Amino acid sequence: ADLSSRVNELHDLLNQYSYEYYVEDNPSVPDSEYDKLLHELIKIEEEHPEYKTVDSPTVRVGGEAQASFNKVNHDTPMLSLGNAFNEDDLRKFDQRIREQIGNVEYMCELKIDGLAVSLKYVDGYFVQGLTRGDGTTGEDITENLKTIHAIPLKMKEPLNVEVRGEAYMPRRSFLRLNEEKEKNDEQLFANPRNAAAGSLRQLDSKLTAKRKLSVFIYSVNDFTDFNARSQSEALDELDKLGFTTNKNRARVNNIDGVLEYIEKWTSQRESLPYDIDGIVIKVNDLDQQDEMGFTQKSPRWAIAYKFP
Ligand SMILES: Clc1cncc(-c2nc[nH]n2)n1
Numbered sequence: 001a002d003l004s005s006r007v008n009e010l011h012d013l014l015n016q017y018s019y020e021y022y023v024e025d026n027p028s029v030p031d032s033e034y035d036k037l038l039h040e041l042i043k044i045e046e047e048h049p050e051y052k053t054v055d056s057p058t059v060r061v062g063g064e065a066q067a068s069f070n071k072v073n074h075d076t077p078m079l080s081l082g083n084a085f086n087e088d089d090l091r092k093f094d095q096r097i098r099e100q101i102g103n104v105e106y107m108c109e110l111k112i113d114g115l116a117v118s119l120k121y122v123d124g125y126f127v128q129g130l131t132r133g134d135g136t137t138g139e140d141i142t143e144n145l146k147t148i149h150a151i152p153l154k155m156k157e158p159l160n161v162e163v164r165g166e167a168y169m170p171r172r173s174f175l176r177l178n179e180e181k182e183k184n185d186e187q188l189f190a191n192p193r194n195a196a197a198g199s200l201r202q203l204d205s206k207l208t209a210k211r212k213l214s215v216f217i218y219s220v221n222d223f224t225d226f227n228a229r230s231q232s233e234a235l236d237e238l239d240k241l242g243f244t245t246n247k248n249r250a251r252v253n254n255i256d257g258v259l260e261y262i263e264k265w266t267s268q269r270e271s272l273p274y275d276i277d278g279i280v281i282k283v284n285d286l287d288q289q290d291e292m293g294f295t296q297k298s299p300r301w302a303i304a305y306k307f308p
Pocket of ligand 1: 080081111218
């Protein structure tokens, strides 16, 4: 039967609703509506499997295909950040930069206590999701990562990029998960990060699907097809491309602003719906980052402040 009108309409609505619920946290429709439409599409695809697509909303429920866990090199190795533990560390960081390249703007972001991941897009389609591993070689968990609504299955523009993000379990879902384990005398997860790890390490993407995971994307391997001239522009651009980014980022003019940001988030981190382990500070301008270069191990243009 030619079901293309209804299939397309279901794709449109479920994509809208998923984005509203999981990326914006702003539903327009009750869960009963989402569930109803998803169920209808699932039945359409069961009875008319020619309508299945690689980026169908039904992908989010997981499938029979198992994540290979194969060792796979990232297109581009993921960076390792140096750490800061106090103000003096940050003043040193700032001083090294300003002595070499002049005064800079800084991008400040929350360091999500998650599983670092790389998400590879080809022609705008999500085609590979790897754990960070050793920074060069990770494990292929693509099939599990596809169940996370916050990871777009298809971007707004058909780019070939490898984005970098942190996958995580929101705290309240972690806690309610542990309530469920307590009721069934199971060993509780130690924390949200361990729960996210356990969930992504399943062989069964259908289990991963029912766990409440999300992501925040913080960079990309290659800026060639980005118009961004800065990290802050780049994140805005990722937003416009369809990715999930952290809205608590801020551009600050100087190291005083950086300290202010850390002072703010030290007090407010308690109220966030996910765990963070620090604050990442980057020279904002992309050309300036390039100018600062890398040590043998780490960017000279970025630092991870770690909470006590
Ligand atoms: Cl380059 C890098 C490495 N690890 C984390 C981050 C990050 N995390 C949040 N924003 N940026 N960036």
